[PDB]
Symmetry: D3
Amino acid sequence: SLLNVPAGKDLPEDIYVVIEIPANADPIKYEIDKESGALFVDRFMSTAMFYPCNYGYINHTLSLDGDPVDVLVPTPYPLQPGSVIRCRPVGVLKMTDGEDAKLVAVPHSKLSKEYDHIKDVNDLPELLKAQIAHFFEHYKDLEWVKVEGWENAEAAKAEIVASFERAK
Amino acid sequence: SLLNVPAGKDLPEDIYVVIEIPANADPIKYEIDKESGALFVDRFMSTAMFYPCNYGYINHTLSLDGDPVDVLVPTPYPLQPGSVIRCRPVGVLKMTDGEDAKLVAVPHSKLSKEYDHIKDVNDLPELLKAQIAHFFEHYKDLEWVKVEGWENAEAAKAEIVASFERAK
Amino acid sequence: SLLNVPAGKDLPEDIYVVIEIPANADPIKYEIDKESGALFVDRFMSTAMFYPCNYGYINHTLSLDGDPVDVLVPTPYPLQPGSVIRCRPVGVLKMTDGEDAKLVAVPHSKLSKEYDHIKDVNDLPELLKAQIAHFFEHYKDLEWVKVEGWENAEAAKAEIVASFERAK
Amino acid sequence: SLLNVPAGKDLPEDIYVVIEIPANADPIKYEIDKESGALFVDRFMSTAMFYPCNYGYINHTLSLDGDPVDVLVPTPYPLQPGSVIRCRPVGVLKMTDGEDAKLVAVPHSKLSKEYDHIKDVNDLPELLKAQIAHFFEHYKDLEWVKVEGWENAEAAKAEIVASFERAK
Amino acid sequence: SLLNVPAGKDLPEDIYVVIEIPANADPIKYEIDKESGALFVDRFMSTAMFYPCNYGYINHTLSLDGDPVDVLVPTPYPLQPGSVIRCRPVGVLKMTDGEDAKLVAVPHSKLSKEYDHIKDVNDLPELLKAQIAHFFEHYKDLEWVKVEGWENAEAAKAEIVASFERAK
Amino acid sequence: SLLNVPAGKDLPEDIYVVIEIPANADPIKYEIDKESGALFVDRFMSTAMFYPCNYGYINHTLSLDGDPVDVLVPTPYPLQPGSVIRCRPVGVLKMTDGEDAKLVAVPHSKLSKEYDHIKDVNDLPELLKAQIAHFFEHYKDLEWVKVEGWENAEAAKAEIVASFERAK
């Protein structure tokens, strides 16, 4: 099941992300249930907003909010909820609800050459970055959250390493 | 797997429904296979009709037609086949092929406040109810079924309780 | 999980195909991971082409390319990745990358009567056959493959039988 | 505008159909407004049914129900409301609300070779024909109509010729 | 063309709205060009938000922002850009960029009985109203606007009457 | 109607393109009819390929193939057939069926800042360029065409200027 997916081939450089919400989909927030590995409807979002990238998590990690590290993964076409994609981290958007750090990872080079030039957080389209920051600032307006800024691939991997160790 | 999803948090008030067919989808009838927990194509519907709500079942229950209790769940956007949604029962549409009772359950308040006012069968939109009755009367016209009417949340829960006990 | 789906009810006549890519979908190539049974993003296709039929494989078989036998299944509406469909084989498109034989199987009569007349490879629409041949010739142009022709239902089943034995 | 589209290149053999409702779409009934040529929302259908083929009319014709001759056109993919397709008639489904005759026309050979073998009403898939008959019998159940049967391409063209003359 | 659509059958009670952006669509802002009546891509929205209802305008009206009165129309399924829907006004959301008043109108009873009970601004779902207010407050965050509140059907019609007179 | 759309605001730098086929759509080839301005189904494509960008033409131009200059326009989301988008040219893919030159134009800066950095043909993603070249080489394989290469924005505008003059 999804409960058995590795954290990655070569942490923190090569990770696997379990997808819960596809890019641009209807406002249904799903989550993988730790008990059955099944896709559960977590909530219907109240705002008229959509996730700008595919949203998921790295299995076998645990951050301080007691949840697995969340990653946002841009792809050329929306992915299937419950699917797994191999990626490499490039940045982290730090915020506070606690501390939520949503990493941004791009598809691994073996899946597509389209993201090869993206190696660090400032290599990502500025508009993509404002749109992601804006979504997190505002998605729970009708349900608090504060963006504090972006950080590089080094910080992202530090976050992966720490959460993985913390999961052990 | 889906075979391990509970019948609910607090039967018969708080149940989980395993989704097989989303609201408004192409006429493909899927079912979860009791052996693998995998989604199987049960049949291609012959009529040009679509399910008016998401269609699924409560795991760990058994009705007299030797099948799990079937539930119809209205949501603001179509759900994913194989996903699970927490709901609360509000009615039952009784019919006969045997006795099929398709319950109607609405999303649990923790998932969305939109259905909070819906507490009993007459709180559901009349048009939604005619449309559901009409679908069951006519979906197998080219494949018999007879609608006998609606019943309240009390009857629905009685149906859940009985089928759950019968499953044990 | 999907890892536990049988090869079929009555090999080679009655098989089950595990679906990875739906007909007419975005160019994302998925595959079921032998380790978790989870849907993995195998690759993003580079060409502006879509699979003309649903694409999948027969579990518990092994061909010479060290992979499970791949099948293409036409249906009236696109299927869900990860779902299973009961079919009956009718042909094989032989090619070479090694030897890849992609079988063509149509939905089993119990799922729909629409494909009952299709019993052998020449009963399939000519346009459907050219379109499939054309897709395989050209889908990896930007990533080699050569079509050698079609073969009947007898050859297809021989291929199923052999790969199943080889899997044992 | 759409008000200026010819009835056809070579009536009754070669006609143009103005599309109002695509095959398999949401239950919104549109119609082209004789005054502006604009697409107007005529009604929201109450039943959970979808048109099995693209639905439209032949401009410059007038039947007895004081409306333009309506045609159903099967295509491999849904068409755009307001678009025009060149076709050739092959049958008519006679009914009564008055007399409604919905013709069935298939795409002209110059647009695609896929329908070339379809020359008369019995050349159409039986399932397609039952599904169309069933839709008309039941689409207004919640809004009367009675199917009386099918007729050949000769009757269809007679219907086109008469309505065109009647329009003059 | 769309330039010739009336403002309504019985202003301000019975109006026609020309649709530019469907409910829940990709973030493309279209507008009807006063010169050709053609649908022009006005802008690609920068925020990850979607219009919660169909968005359009009443032809033959002119407000103070030198633009036609804009209306938001909830329907059970998304409409086609460029289509026209008969409605009746029920409220207005007043704001300021100038003065923008976006009316809310529901489908006319002749198109569907589903909105008959909605007669005034407080009859609209509270969540629908917060979602609309929230969208306008935030849709141009990356491109200013301030919501001042809702008003009744009387104010809405006053707005229609005034803008129509102003258009003459 | 669409027949009245200008060639552009400031030819050859600022043009308007009339869209016939959206990016990534079903294989239906539409064209705007010079007589009514209506969208006509030109043909159903036989290959399992989709246009990689929105496809259209510049009104009021005439190339040597006796047809209006065709343009391919990448956008973040698919456009509506029949809509108009303001763009600026950046390249031309020269080929031969005669001489077909399909220009590539990107959305005008006033519609979105996302394409501002794209000023010449080599500023376009290499993969986007191979995919477009590949599509034209192969889309009519089952219906000839030969790609000869790309050219800069200067050549593109020369092509626009010449065809516009030729249209006068």
